[PDB]
Design a protein around this ligand. Structure first.
Ligand SMILES: NC(=O)c1ccc[n+]([C@@H]2O[C@H](COP(=O)([O-])OP(=O)(O)OC[C@H]3O[C@@H](n4cnc5c(N)ncnc54)[C@H](O)[C@@H]3O)[C@@H](O)[C@H]2O)c1
Ligand SMILES: NC(=O)c1ccc[n+]([C@@H]2O[C@H](COP(=O)([O-])OP(=O)(O)OC[C@H]3O[C@@H](n4cnc5c(N)ncnc54)[C@H](O)[C@@H]3O)[C@@H](O)[C@H]2O)c1
Ligand SMILES: NC(=O)c1ccc[n+]([C@@H]2O[C@H](COP(=O)([O-])OP(=O)(O)OC[C@H]3O[C@@H](n4cnc5c(N)ncnc54)[C@H](O)[C@@H]3O)[C@@H](O)[C@H]2O)c1
Ligand SMILES: NC(=O)c1ccc[n+]([C@@H]2O[C@H](COP(=O)([O-])OP(=O)(O)OC[C@H]3O[C@@H](n4cnc5c(N)ncnc54)[C@H](O)[C@@H]3O)[C@@H](O)[C@H]2O)c1
Ligand SMILES: OC[C@H]1O[C@@H](O)[C@H](O)[C@@H](O)[C@@H]1O
Ligand SMILES: OC[C@H]1O[C@@H](O)[C@H](O)[C@@H](O)[C@@H]1O
Ligand SMILES: OC[C@H]1O[C@@H](O)[C@H](O)[C@@H](O)[C@@H]1O
Ligand SMILES: OC[C@H]1O[C@@H](O)[C@H](O)[C@@H](O)[C@@H]1O
Ligand SMILES: Oc1c(F)ccc(Cl)c1F
Ligand SMILES: Oc1c(F)ccc(Cl)c1F
Ligand SMILES: Oc1c(F)ccc(Cl)c1F
Ligand SMILES: Oc1c(F)ccc(Cl)c1F
Ligand code: NA
Ligand code: NA
Ligand code: NA
Ligand code: NA
Lengths: 252, 252, 252, 252
C-alpha cells in the first residue's frame, strides 16, 4: 500500500528493467499501464498481474503516445507517475562505424520518446502532484567505449531530467532519473550473444562492479517506487543503481 | 515490516534528522538503538517508541562507542545497520576567524566519530550482511560560504563512504551516504536565531530550493530506510535529499 | 609559440566565444580556420588576423563539413585541433511551449554538427596525435529553467566527449570539453534584449557568479589553448569556466 | 613570461609532483619558494634553478609555516600563488588495520597543513589578487581500495577548496584544486616497492588509465600554471589530471 490508489505508466514495460518496474509498482498497490511496442511480453504481464494492463504503444510515434495518455485517463481517471524506460543500446560500434542517421534514430527512441510522453502527461501530473522518473544510464555520466550515440542519448536524458525538475518545481511535480549500471536483462543477454565469447563477456560485465554481480530489474524497480512514493524532497536527482561500478580504479 | 527483525543504531538520534531516522526505522519494523550525548530527547524517544531504546554515548569518546556496540549486541543479538548522523554545524565563520583547534574538534565529531563507530560495528555488520549509512551534506559537494571547517568534514565523510564501500564490497556490506540540503531541525532554528533577522534567514533558506521549502527529518528518514532495506545494488552512492538546491543558476 | 606549427578549426568562430577562441589560438602561434554560417564576422576576422582564414560552413550540412575538412588539409597540410563551438541557445521556453520539431533542429546544430565534424576530422587528428575540444555548457551538468531542449543538447555533448575520449585514447587522440557559464557574448546580449527589463536580466546574470561578473570569450579561449597544447594527460574532462556559479546555495 | 614578476610558494616542492610544479612556474617567469620538510631535494633544486629558493618548512608545524610566509614576504616583497602540494599516501591498509591515531596524523599533513598555510597567506594574496591551488586526488572523488584515511583527507581538501573559493570571491582571490590520478613519482615508486611484485603493481597502475600510461609531474605543473596565470574566471574548480581513469567500466 505504499503507492495505493495511484496510476503509473511504464514505457518499455514488457520485459527487462521495465517489467521489473511494473512488478514493483503493482506490489506497492498502484495500477500500472504497461506500454510497449512488442505485444508478447506486455500482454502476458497483463494476464499475470491484476492491476496491470497492456497498451500497445511505440514511443517514437506521437499519435501512439497521445493515445496512451488519453486511454490511461479514460480507463483509470488519473495519472500519478510516468516511468520513461523504453530505450535501446545498439551493439558495440567504433565511432567511424556510426552514422548521423543511426544517431538520429537512437535519439528518437532514447530521448525524444521520453520527451514526448512527459510533455503529454504533465497536465495530468500537475493535477495529481505526480512525478516523472527517467531511466538513464551510468555511462551517460562516465562514458563507455564503442557507444558514442548511446552515451550521448543518456547524457541528454540525465540533463533534461534536471532542466524539467526546475521548470516543474513551482507546480509540485518532481522529475528524477535512475542511472543503472550493468543490469542482467534480455538486452544484456542479446548483446553478449553477439560477442565471440559470450560467457567471457558476461563475466567481464559481472566483475565491472565491486559487488561482483550485475543488478536485477527488481532492484531498479525498488528504486523507482522509492522515488515515486517516498522521495518528496528529491527532484532533479540521478539515483545510481550500479553496484559501485563508478568507484575506484579499474583496468581501462 | 520492510526491515523487520533487523537492529539499527542511529547516532545523534535524540532530535532533528536523527530522530526522524529513528522513527522511520521503527515504522519499518526494526529495533533501534538511539545514541546521543544529550539525555533529554533520546530518553523521551525511548519512552515514546516501543522497539527503540536509548544509550548515552558521545561518539568522540572511543570507550563510549565500544560500549554502545557491545551493549547493542548484548541486548539485541545482532547489528544490521549503522546510521552515522551525529554531527554539528558551527555558526557562520569567515576563514580568518576559524582556528586549527576548532577545525580539529569539528573533525573529531563530524568525521572521526563516524569512522570509530563504523570500525567497531563492521565485524557484526559482516556477519549480518548489514550496511552503513553516513549522513553527509550537500555542501560537501558544492561548498558553502563561511563554513570552511564544516564543508571540509562533510567532503571527507562523502569520500570516506566511497573508500569504505570498495573495501567492504567483497564481504557484502554496503556503505552509502545521504547528503541533505536545508532540513528544518533544531540546529537550523538555533543557527537562524543567531542572525540579525532570524525570519529573513529562514525565508532565504526556504528559497534556496526550487521546491520553495526546506526538507523534513522524516524525508531523510525515508531515504535511510530505502538504502538499508531496498537498495541491495547500491553501494558508495551519495543520495541527495536537497529539494533541488544544487540545480540551475541562483543569486550567488 | 605554445601551439606553433599547428592547424586548428574553430566552428562558429565569427563572433562571441568562437572568435575569442580563434584569437587565443592565433596568439599561441597556430593557424586557424574560422568556420561560420554567417560571412560578416568571420570574413572581417580573417582580414584582421594573419594566420586565420575564413571558410563558410554550416555545420548542420554534411557536405559543408566535408568541404571544410578537405579545404583545411588542402590549404594547410595537417589538422591538429577541432574546436566544436557552433551552437545556439533559444529564448526562454516553458516545457509546454517546446516542440519535438524544435528539439530536433536544436539537436542538429548543438550535437550532430559537433558529431559530424569530429567524425570527418578524426582520420587527420589520428595522424597528428591531435585533439578535440567541445564547447558544452554548465547547464548541461546542473540544469537551467525554461531550456529543456538546450540543456538536453549540452548534456549529450558532455557525455559524448567522454565516450569519444575512451574510443580514441588508444590512438593518442584526446577529447575534452569546456563548460562555460554566463559569458558576455552577442548571444547573451540578444537574449537579454528580449526580456522586459534587459538591464535587470544582465545584472541577474552577473550576480549568478560568486565572482560577480560574467566571463569573457578570451577566458574560454585560454582554457581551449591549455587543453590543446599543455593538457597531455587530460582526456574526457569537463573544464568549468563559470566563475563559480555552481558553488554554494543561491535563490532558486 | 606567462607569470613574470609573480611570487609562488610550493609546499612539498623538493621532489615528485611538487618539483614538477616548481619547474613549471620557474619556466613561466615566476620566482618560487620551495617549501619542504626534507633538505635533500629542495636544496639541490634551488642550486639548479635561478629564481627558485629553498626554505625548510614542515607544514604540520604552525611556527614553521608562519616563518615560511614572513620569509617569503621579506625576501620577495609579495605573494601571488600558494600551491598546497605537501601530502602523503600511506601503504595499503584494510579498514580494520587503520587507527584513529594514524587518521589524525594524516589529516594533520594532508588537510590541516593546507589549511594553515592558506590562512597565513590569504592577507597577502588579497593584496595581490593572488590565488590558491590545492593538490587533491582523483580518489577523493571516486574512492580507492585500502585507503580510507587517505581518501577522506582528499575529499576534505576538494570540498574545502570550494568553500574557500566562495569566501574569497568578493576579494578577487581564486581558489582551485588539481586532482591528479596515477602520477609516476618517488612516492608511487616507493609504494610499488612494498608490493610482492613491484613490476606487476606498476603495470596495473599504467593500465588504470585509458591512455595506458601514468602521468608526469610536468603535466600537473602545466595545469597549475594554467590555473594561476590564465584561468581568471575559474574558482572552486577541480581540474582532473588523470589520463581518463574515471571514464568507463573497468575490472573492479
Ligand atoms: N540493461 C542494462 O544493463 C541497462 C543499464 C543502464 C540503462 N539501461 C536502460 O534501461 C532501459 C531498459 O533496458 P533493458 O535492459 O531492460 O532493455 P530490454 O531490451 O530488455 O527491454 C526494453 C523494452 O522496451 C521496449 N521498447 C523498445 N523500443 C520501444 C519503443 N519505441 N516503444 C515502446 N517500447 C519500446 C522493448 O520492446 C522492450 O520490451 C533502457 O532505457 C536502457 O537504456 C539498461
Ligand atoms: N539540518 C540540516 O539542514 C542539515 C543539512 C545537511 C546535513 N546535516 C547533518 O545532519 C546531521 C544532523 O543534523 P541536525 O540538523 O539534525 O542537527 P541537530 O543539532 O538538530 O541534532 C544533532 C543531534 O546529534 C547529537 N550529537 C551531537 N554531538 C554528538 C556526539 N558527540 N555524540 C552523540 N550525539 C551527538 C545532538 O545532541 C543532537 O541530538 C548532522 O550530521 C548534520 O551535519 C544537517
Ligand atoms: N554565451 C554563454 O554564456 C554560453 C555559455 C555556455 C555555453 N555557451 C556555448 O558557447 C557556444 C558559442 O556561444 P556564443 O555565446 O558565443 O554564441 P554566439 O551566438 O554569439 O556565436 C555563435 C556563432 O556560431 C555561429 N553558428 C551558429 N550556427 C552555426 C552553424 N549551423 N554553422 C556554423 N556556425 C554556426 C553563429 O553565426 C555565431 O557566429 C555555443 O555552443 C553555446 O551553447 C555559451
Ligand atoms: N603520485 C600520485 O600518483 C598522486 C596522485 C594524486 C595525488 N597526489 C598528491 O600529490 C602530492 C604530492 O605527491 P607525490 O607523489 O609527488 O609525493 P612525493 O612523496 O614524491 O613528494 C611529496 C613531497 O612533500 C614533502 N613533504 C611531506 N610531508 C611534508 C611536510 N609535513 N611538510 C613539507 N613537505 C612535506 C616530501 O618531503 C616530498 O618532497 C600529495 O599531496 C599527494 O597526495 C599524488
Ligand atoms: O534474460 C536475462 C534476464 O532478464 C531479466 O529481465 C529476467 O527477469 C531474468 O529472468 C532473466 O534471467
Ligand atoms: O525545531 C525545528 C523542527 O525540528 C524538527 O526536528 C522537528 O521534527 C520539528 O517539530 C521542528 O519544527
Ligand atoms: O556583444 C557583447 C560582447 O560579445 C563579445 O564577444 C565581444 O568580445 C564584446 O566586445 C562584446 O561586448
Ligand atoms: O621516481 C619516479 C619518478 O619521479 C618523478 O618525480 C621524476 O621526475 C622521475 O625522474 C622519476 O622517474
Ligand atoms: O546503459 C547500459 C550500460 F551501462 C551497460 C549495459 C547496457 Cl545493456 C546498457 F544499456
Ligand atoms: O549541512 C548543512 C546545510 F547544507 C545547510 C544547513 C545546515 Cl544546518 C547544515 F548542517
Ligand atoms: O549555456 C548557456 C548558459 F549557461 C548561460 C547563458 C547562455 Cl547564453 C548559454 F548559452
Ligand atoms: O592520490 C593518489 C592516487 F590517486 C594514486 C596513487 C597515489 Cl601514490 C596517490 F597518492
Ligand atoms: Na491485469
Ligand atoms: Na522504547
Ligand atoms: Na588572415
Ligand atoms: Na636558485
Amino acid at each position: 500500500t505504499r503507492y495505493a490508489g495511484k496510476v503509473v505508466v511504464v514505457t518499455g514495460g514488457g520485459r527487462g528493467i521495465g517489467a521489473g518496474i511494473v512488478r514493483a509498482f503493482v506490489n506497492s498497490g498502484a495500477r500500472v499501464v504497461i506500454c510497449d511496442k512488442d505485444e508478447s511480453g506486455g500482454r502476458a504481464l497483463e494476464q499475470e498481474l491484476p492491476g496491470a494492463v497492456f497498451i500497445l504503444c511505440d514511443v517514437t510515434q506521437e499519435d501512439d503516445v497521445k493515445t496512451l495518455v488519453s486511454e490511461t485517463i479514460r480507463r483509470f481517471g488519473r495519472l500519478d507517475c510516468v516511468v520513461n524506460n523504453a530505450g535501446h543500446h545498439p551493439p558495440p560500434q567504433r565511432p567511424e562505424e556510426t552514422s548521423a542517421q543511426g544517431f538520429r534514430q537512437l535519439l528518437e527512441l532514447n530521448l525524444l520518446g521520453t520527451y514526448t510522453l512527459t510533455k503529454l502527461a504533465l497536465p495530468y501530473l500537475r493535477k495529481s502532484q505526480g512525478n516523472v522518473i527517467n531511466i538513464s544510464s551510468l555511462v551517460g555520466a562516465i562514458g563507455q567505449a564503442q557507444a558514442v550515440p548511446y552515451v550521448a542519448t543518456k547524457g541528454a536524458v540525465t540533463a533534461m531530467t534536471k532542466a524539467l525538475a526546475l521548470d516543474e518545481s513551482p507546480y509540485g511535480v518532481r522529475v528524477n532519473c535512475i542511472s543503472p549500471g550493468n543490469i542482467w536483462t534480455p538486452l544484456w543477454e542479446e548483446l553478449a550473444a553477439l560477442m565471440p565469447d559470450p560467457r567471457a563477456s558476461i563475466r567481464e560485465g559481472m566483475l565491472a562492479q565491486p559487488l561482483g554481480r550485475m543488478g536485477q530489474p527488481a532492484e531498479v524497480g525498488a528504486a523507482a517506487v522509492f522515488l515515486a512514493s517516498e522521495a518528496n524532497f528529491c527532484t532533479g536527482i540521478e539515483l545510481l543503481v550500479t553496484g559501485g561500478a563508478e568507484l575506484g580504479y579499474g583496468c581501462k
